[PDB]
Structure 1
Amino acid sequence: MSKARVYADVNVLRPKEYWDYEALTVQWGEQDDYEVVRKVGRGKYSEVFEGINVNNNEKCIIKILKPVKKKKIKREIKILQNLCGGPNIVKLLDIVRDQHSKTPSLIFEYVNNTDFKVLYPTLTDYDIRYYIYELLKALDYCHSQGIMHRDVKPHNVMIDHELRKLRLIDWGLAEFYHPGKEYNVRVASRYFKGPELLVDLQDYDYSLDMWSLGCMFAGMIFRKEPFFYGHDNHDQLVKIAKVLGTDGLNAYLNKYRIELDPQLEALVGRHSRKPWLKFMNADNQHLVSPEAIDFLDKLLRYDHQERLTALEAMTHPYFQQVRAAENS
């Protein structure tokens, strides 16, 4: 029986309407208020375009969704409305649908993002600390509001490097946290899936996002994208095991009375824990200081209950300069 160590009763104390997303009644806006300027991306759930609000002539992002269940879309809408306004949380501006096809589109604030594949390689040591701190603000905020993002990864972190503005987007996999609830483990992107998802521990919590953040962080300071490069869910756990070691995995499994599938246990085998510094090289040396390793280490723990909370992470000395700078 696992439960969050913080913000566990957020949804218990709030009005039921706050988390009963299925009770939501979507208020559709005017589809003609937004015009497509150009396609900028795509996903398995939608096609994304840069658009313009014809009223104020301001830029926006139009997410045209592929067929989606009513329950599914209400969850994303409710979460966005509940979090709108919070620190670095992308803003949902409008919700519209095509009368004939019934195809819905979500209108979001526009961020002049730079592809992380091109951006990250140019980030200085300080930039990394700064942006990670900014992302942390978003995570502590949503967690404090009883919400798990469940899909933290570079693709879901828009960054306007010129303005140094960051936004956590794509809350389509986000869910409300309720003590004891068993969630679907089929969330997050493979390279950022926490051990709990990989071993089928369903009663996970906000801490899942902290593992994902840890993966992202490791990728940045060690300049290895992604850090844990697994081919499938089974291989993903193996890649993790080969770094953190199997002893820790075994202890984790025994603590939560979890039994790996025979095939998986075979693939994982036995591995010694590899020190973080073994991943240091001339390409990343200017980024792998003791404070960074200490911070990463406290994020990447098998036991989700062991990981730093977003609030704790923000106070880690690794971010002391960012904090001092902010307190000015």
Structure 2
Amino acid sequence: GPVPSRARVYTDVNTHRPSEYWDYESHVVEWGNQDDYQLVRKLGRGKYSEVFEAINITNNEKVVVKILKPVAAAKIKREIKILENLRGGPNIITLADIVKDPVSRTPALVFEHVNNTDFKQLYQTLTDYDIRFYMYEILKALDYCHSMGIMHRDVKPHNVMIDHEHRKLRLIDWGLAEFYHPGQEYNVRVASRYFKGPELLVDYQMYDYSLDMWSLGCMLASMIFRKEPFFHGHDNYDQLVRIAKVLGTEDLYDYIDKYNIELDPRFNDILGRHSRKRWERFVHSENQHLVSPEALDFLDKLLRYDHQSRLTAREAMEHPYFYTVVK
């Protein structure tokens, strides 16, 4: 069977912290007053929640209210516990309150408001310096949450709120986040298709924080190469073939052989043989202003099949790509 794996960092955070920290099922929710909030506009709806812009009438402050749907409702304690554990962390969305929505009969999470700039608008105008700057801010959030024994598991552009005017960034939607326990087998049906790490795509369940580092690398490749998404799979199987057309099939086979993983036999008819491509292949006259030798070297160290080989968030912050960023 599969060879076991452990994170190379923050391995034993959850064992040396008290049980009340990670045992989210034993957590007693403190309920706030639903009457303090006035819903103003529905921002959106997903399969797990409905999100609104609201006003806290006890201080006139704008807030965001996330009304959880019943599917999400069953696992709210994990999300609430994670949010409380991470509250005050750098660039982590702040949970302000938890109320019972009288219509949905489900919990509603109230968050600080972030005046999010449109994804298309921001994607199109970010300079080389702004990419580096915001990547560094995302790394602060990821090293903080990994240091706290938590993996996000859904890093993607829609989960990163940016108020470009105030250069404020927040990592949101901790609904898929989980506590890392060494040797635990996790569900591989996490993260959005284009951001899924190879470990999910080959059904390797003993993954860790390094999954977030793959997803971060996919975001970086899209922004510096102006190719959205970078790995554009039609389904989860084609997602792996898209990765293999860039990183190559030999390094893929080295990875699955290292962990004694067998690919789904359906790959025989779609995977083929592909050499590893040099990152410079993706440079052209329309993205050259966002690329540098430091960007390519940094991307190379995130987008690695072997989850144990990827840079950690703290090592990533040490990289020359961020030397230009004012700290």
Gap change, CA 1:150 and 1:163, over 3 Å in 2: same
**What's 1:300 paired with?**
303
Task: Determine the structure 2 residue equivalent to 1:287.
Answer: 290
Runs (4+) of structure 1 exceeding 4 A deviation are none
Q: Which amino acid aligns with 2:26?
A: A
Q: Is the contact made by 2:249 and 2:274 (CA closer than 8 Å) also made in structure 1?
A: yes
SS of the residue corresponding to residue 38 of structure 1 reads strand
Q: Deviations over 1:15-54 (max 9, x none)?
A: 0110000001111111111111111222111111111101
> In the alignment, does 2:11 pair up with 1:8?
yes
SS of equivalent to 2:323: helix
Q: Which residue of 2 aligns with 1:252?
A: 255
Residue 254 of structure 1: how far off its partner (Å): 0.3
Q: Does 1:112 align with 2:112?
A: no
1:315 corresponds to 2:307: no
Give the one of 59, 66, 69 matched to 1:66.
69
| Alpha-carbon shift at residue 69 of structure 1 (Å) | 5.5
TM-score normalised according to structure 1 size: 0.97
The Cα RMSD (Å) is 1.0
TM-score, scaled to structure 2: 0.97
Query: AA paired with 2:48?
Result: Y
Deviation, 1:68, is: 2.9
> Partner of 1:51: helix, strand, or coil?
strand
| Displacement after TM superposition at 1:320 (Å) | 0.7
Q: What amino acid maps onto 2:222 in structure 1?
A: G
Q: Structure 1 residue 141 and structure 2 residue 174: aligned? A: no
Per-residue deviation, 1:266: 2.8
Counterpart of 1:186, as a letter, is R
What's the CA shift string for 1:224-282, capped at 9, x where partnerless?
11111111111100100111000000000100000011102432121111111111111
Q: In the TM superposition, what whole-angstrom CA distance separates every residue of 1:77-133 from its partner, at most 9, and x where no partner exists?
A: 000000000000000111111346412211111000112222111001000000000
How many residues are paired up? 324
Q: Residue 85 of structure 1 aligns to a residue in which SS?
A: coil
Alignment check: 8 A CA contact 1:22 1:71 kept: no
Query: 2-side partners of 1:288 and 1:38: how far apart?
Result: 39
Match of 1:130 in 2: 133
Is the contact between residue 207 and residue 307 of structure 1 (CA under 8 Å) also seen in structure 2? yes
Tell me how far 1:66 sits from its aligned partner.
1.3
Unaligned stretches of 5+ in structure 1? Answer: none
Give identity over the alignment, percent.
Answer: 76
Number of the residue aligned with 1:243: 246
